[PDB]
Structures are given as structure tokens and as C-alpha cells.
Amino acid sequence: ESYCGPCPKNWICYKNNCYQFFDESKNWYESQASCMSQNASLLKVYSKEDQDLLKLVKSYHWMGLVHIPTNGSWQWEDGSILSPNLLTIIEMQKGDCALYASSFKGYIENCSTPNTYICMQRTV
Amino acid sequence: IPLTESYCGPCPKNWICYKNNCYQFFDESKNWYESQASCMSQNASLLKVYSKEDQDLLKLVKSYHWMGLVHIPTNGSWQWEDGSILSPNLLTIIEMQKGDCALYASSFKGYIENCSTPNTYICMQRTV
Amino acid sequence: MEPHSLRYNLTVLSWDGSVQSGFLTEVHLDGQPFLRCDRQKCRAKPQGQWAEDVLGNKTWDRETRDLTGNGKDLRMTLAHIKDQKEGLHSLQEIRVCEIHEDNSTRSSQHFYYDGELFLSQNLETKEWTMPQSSRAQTLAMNVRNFLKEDAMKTKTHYHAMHADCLQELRRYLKSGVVLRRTVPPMVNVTRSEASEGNITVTCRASGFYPWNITLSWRQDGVSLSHDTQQWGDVLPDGNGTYQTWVATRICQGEEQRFTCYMEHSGNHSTHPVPS
């Protein structure tokens, strides 16, 4: 349509999804919070086609992808399990969180390490 | 505090919308003029930067893409695809190739290049 | 005279394959320590065009903004270099440009892994080059492929890289931050006492810049052999200038027959032995 889905005032809207980038460096946890503070969450990656615009992202930022030891898989901060054939994850810094980098990459970082982040919120 | 969810103005189907401005990134490297025409063929134009504030998303774009910044022989100045002179503290213009066009780069930069050189581009439509 | 130059030297580290958060970037201007930037901010190293400290620093925002981005990118680059050796590892990306007298330029990009060079590109010609080493070639391909496929570096990225360095070199020179001034040497001729009707005359030139200087003794105006003279090295002062000296043995009495000839940045002077 000629109008882009419901989104927080002054956020980036693309194909009905809303995004926002924050310059303020923070740790994963403190970042996870920043998102929830605005009824959202850390960037979640479900479609290479719908989140097409993610290829234009410069540098790396906090993503909402966590790692659970018990099992040994990566799943989103909500509950969702990273859908195969989306992100190529790379070991950068020993840790349990991951940062997003251009062309669907996920670099592992120490959740305690401050960084910039991306908050997103879907539509129905 | 509430939680006001508004809609983003009149934009072409699946374009990016931010603060009532539409943008689309075309990864088909093309001539500057070929890009001008490409955006004009959609009731748009090549990206025009008018405020580091209203267009702060431009801070996180990777690579280089054509934009409406045009040269002027007489003076030597720059202006957009509509006489709009280029404001003072908006872009840092780096002299990359001797040319009359400019590629937009991340963090409000403008690299001068040959207008006849193919590069990716960005179209911009200012919502009514 | 020598060319104006700018050099950025970025360094990232990892311990047991774990890329550390902090990184350092050293900026050198015309061969002098100019900037130091950690993961957070850039700070000036002493001696400016000022000599106090208050200089308009905050413009260090520009370098802070950019050197951090490159710092972060280089971290992703180290991450793609998988090495099976415990301990520390480092990766450096050195970008450098120059402006010669004729205003022609020179510019390159070099990668160092654990202190050794492994890849480099002449940013003028855009032609990559790599050492003739089994180990260096593996590293090289790893990085060159990451820059191609993952980093998505185009032909234009390198055209801009070339321009960036050159425009910043010109920005620093055009701002007058670079004060390369000639400092003519001070010249002093002294003698030792006659230990058998012979004395050692010494010609000392000090506190000068630039580094290049010609000093030599002459008999009746004709320069002596290099073997018949004692030459001192060229030593840095501790003030940004240099000192050196030359000497020779002469039969006492022939004194006014000897002279020290010196040429430093255009000036050619002659100095007799004190009477």
C-alpha cells in the first residue's frame, strides 16, 4: 500500500515492520531493556526477503539472538528458534549473545560488552 | 506514558518510510543520468539530503550510492535536482574522481565521481 | 625536501581466538605522533602548533567517528582468521598516503598478522600484492576473500579509501597544524691539545632540521679523504632536531690551512679553525 504499517512516532518503517537504531553503547541486557522500554525487542531476523533492507546496515549492532547452553542452539529473545538458512553465525568474542552484521551475519560477543543496538516490532 | 502507534505517509508500495520521506535502494549499478531517469520514471528523484536530523537513518547505510547532487560550471557550487542549493553543514564532499556528480556514503559524506560511471542509487519521494 | 604524509595504524587483538573489545589506532602526521585512539576517543600527542593543550580538540570527533568504525570492521576481519594456536594474536591494518614536491601522491594499505606483513595494496594502482610465503598466502586469501564476499568491498570502496587519506592529509596541512620548519645548524670548531706537535680539530653542527646534512674537512679548500676523517653519527637532540660532528688530525701550525665545509638545506658555509 501507499502507507506503511503501525509504528512508533519517528521510527523506520519497511514492509510493515518498524526499526530504530540507538547510538548509545550498552550491554545486551541493558539493550534488551532499552527495547522493552518502548514495547519492542532486539532485532529479530525471520525473512531475508521481508527484511531485505538489512543488507544496507553499516557496522555491527546488538541483535536479540541468545544462546542456551543446556541444549546448544541459538534462539530469539522471545522464544522463537532461529530458522535455518537465515544467519551465518561467526565466533568473534567468547560469549552467549550475538551482534548483527550486513548480509545476514551474526557475530558472537560477550553480552557484557557495550555496543549499539537495533529495536524492532512486528505487525500482527 | 501511552504508546502512540502512527502510520508513515504516502509511499510507493514496498519502499522505506522514515519521517514522511520515502526511500528505496536499487542495487543495479547505473549511469548517473540513467539513475536520474530511473527515479524520475517513478515520480521520484535521486536522494536529496536536507537535514542530518530528519534523515538520520542515512547514518547507517553501507557502500556508495548516487544522489541528486549536481554541479554548476559557472559558480562551481552544487545544487539538487531542483535548484535547491546545498545547505552549509550537511555533507562533507570528498574529491574522489574528477567528475560532476556525487555518490552518497555513510555519515553524511559525498564522494565526487564520473557521472558516466555505473553505481547503485537511492530514489527519494517527499510525501505530499 | 621530503613529502608530507599521513599514516593510520589500527590494531586489534584476540586471546585464544577471542577478539578483544578494545583496539588502538595511531595517527602519524609527517612522521610525528599525532593521535592516539582507543575504542572510545582520540587524543592528541604533545607539541602541536599550539604548545599548551587547549587546542580545538573536539574536532577529534571526525577521527573518532571514523577510526572507531574501522576498528570495529577490523574486529570482524580478525574473527574470520581462524588460527589453532593458543595465546595472543594481533591484526593490523595500516593505511598511508604521501604528497611529494611535484604534488604527485603515493598511497597504500597493509595488513600485519602477529607482527608480520601478509597482504598489501597500492591504493594508486589498486593492485594487491603478497609475500612469497606459504603461511602468508593462506592468511592473505582469507582476508581478501572476506573483503570480497562478506565485507562486500567494491572497486569504489578503494577509490574512496584512497581519497579519504589524501583529503585528510590536505585538511591537516591546510589548517596549519603541520609546521615543518627548517632549523639551520649551529657550527662550532674546537681543537684538542698538541700531543706531539699534532692536534685533532673537530667540527660540530647541532640543533638542526631537517636530518640531511653534509659536513667535511678541507685542506686548502680541497675536501679530505673519508678515511682520514672521524665521523660521528647523526643523533636526535631530544628537542626534535639533530647533532653530528666530523674530525681530523693535522700537524700543529698548518691550522689556518684547514676548514670545515658544511651544506644544510640550501646553505653552504665554511668554518675555519679558531686561532
Swiss-Prot record, chain A:
Q: Which residues form the C-type lectin domain?
A: 6-121
Chain ranges sitting on the Extracellular side read: 1-124
Provenance organism: Homo sapiens (Human)
Query: Which UniProt keywords are listed?
Result: Adaptive immunity, Cell membrane, Differentiation, Disulfide bond, Glycoprotein, Immunity, Innate immunity, Lectin, Membrane, Receptor, Signal-anchor, Transmembrane, Transmembrane helix
Tissue specificity as recorded in UniProt: Expressed in natural killer (NK) cells, CD8(+) alpha-beta and gamma-delta T-cells. Expressed on essentially all CD56+CD3- NK cells from freshly isolated PBMC. Expressed in interferon-producing killer dendritic cells (IKDCs).
The full protein's residues present here are 93 to 216 of 216
The organism's lineage is: Eukaryota, Metazoa, Chordata, Craniata, Vertebrata
Any one GO CC term of the record: plasma membrane
Q: What induces it, per record?
A: Up-regulated by interleukin IL15 in primary NK cells.
Q: What protein name does the entry list?
A: NKG2-D type II integral membrane protein
Listed under subunit, the entry gives: Homodimer; disulfide-linked. Heterohexamer composed of two subunits of KLRK1 and four subunits of HCST/DAP10. Interacts (via transmembrane domain) with HCST/DAP10 (via transmembrane domain); the interaction is required for KLRK1 NK cell surface and induces NK cell-mediated cytotoxicity. Does not interact with TYROBP. Interacts with CEACAM1; recruits PTPN6 that dephosphorylates VAV1.
From Swiss-Prot, chain C:
Looking at the keywords, is Electron transport present? no
| A GO term, aspect molecular function | receptor ligand activity
| Principal subcellular localisation of the protein | membrane
Look up what happens after changing G207S.
Answer: In allele MICA*004, allele MICA*005, allele MICA*006, allele MICA*008, allele MICA*009, allele MICA*010, allele MICA*016, allele MICA*019, allele MICA*022, allele MICA*024, allele MICA*027, allele MICA*033, allele MICA*034, allele MICA*035, allele MICA*037, allele MICA*038, allele MICA*039, allele MICA*042, allele MICA*044, allele MICA*048, allele MICA*049, allele MICA*053, allele MICA*054 and allele MICA*056
Result, substituting G176S: In allele MICA*004, allele MICA*006, allele MICA*009, allele MICA*010, allele MICA*016, allele MICA*019, allele MICA*031, allele MICA*033, allele MICA*036, allele MICA*044, allele MICA*049, allele MICA*054 and allele MICA*056
Among the entry's GO cellular component annotations, what is one?
Answer: extracellular space
The intrachain disulfides are C37-C42, C97-C165, C203-C260
Outcome after substituting T214I: In allele MICA*008, allele MICA*010, allele MICA*016, allele MICA*019, allele MICA*022, allele MICA*027, allele MICA*033, allele MICA*035, allele MICA*037, allele MICA*039, allele MICA*042, allele MICA*048, allele MICA*053, allele MICA*054 and allele MICA*056
Q: Name one GO biological process term.
A: negative regulation of natural killer cell activation
Mutating S216T has which effect? In allele MICA*004, allele MICA*006, allele MICA*008, allele MICA*009, allele MICA*010, allele MICA*016, allele MICA*019, allele MICA*022, allele MICA*024, allele MICA*027, allele MICA*033, allele MICA*034, allele MICA*035, allele MICA*037, allele MICA*038, allele MICA*039, allele MICA*042, allele MICA*044, allele MICA*048, allele MICA*049, allele MICA*053, allele MICA*054 and allele MICA*056
Tissues in which the UniProt entry reports expression: Widely expressed with the exception of the central nervous system where it is absent. Expressed predominantly in gastric epithelium and also in monocytes, keratinocytes, endothelial cells, fibroblasts and in the outer layer of Hassal's corpuscles within the medulla of normal thymus. In skin, expressed mainly in the keratin layers, basal cells, ducts and follicles. Also expressed in many, but not all, epithelial tumors of lung, breast, kidney, ovary, prostate and colon. In thyomas, overexpressed in cortical and medullar epithelial cells.
**Domain Ig-like C1-type residue range list:** 185-274
Mapped to this chain, the residue ranges on the Extracellular side of the membrane are 2-275
Q: Which UniProt keywords apply?
A: Adaptive immunity, Cell membrane, Cytolysis, Cytoplasm, Disulfide bond, Glycoprotein, Host-virus interaction, Immunity, Immunoglobulin domain, Lipoprotein, Membrane, Palmitate, Signal, Transmembrane, Transmembrane helix, Ubl conjugation
What additional remark is attached to this entry? Recognized by antibodies in the sera of some organ transplant recipients and may be a target molecule in allograft rejection.
Q: What is this protein called?
A: MHC class I polypeptide-related sequence A
From which organism does this entry originate?
A: Homo sapiens
Write the gene name.
MICA
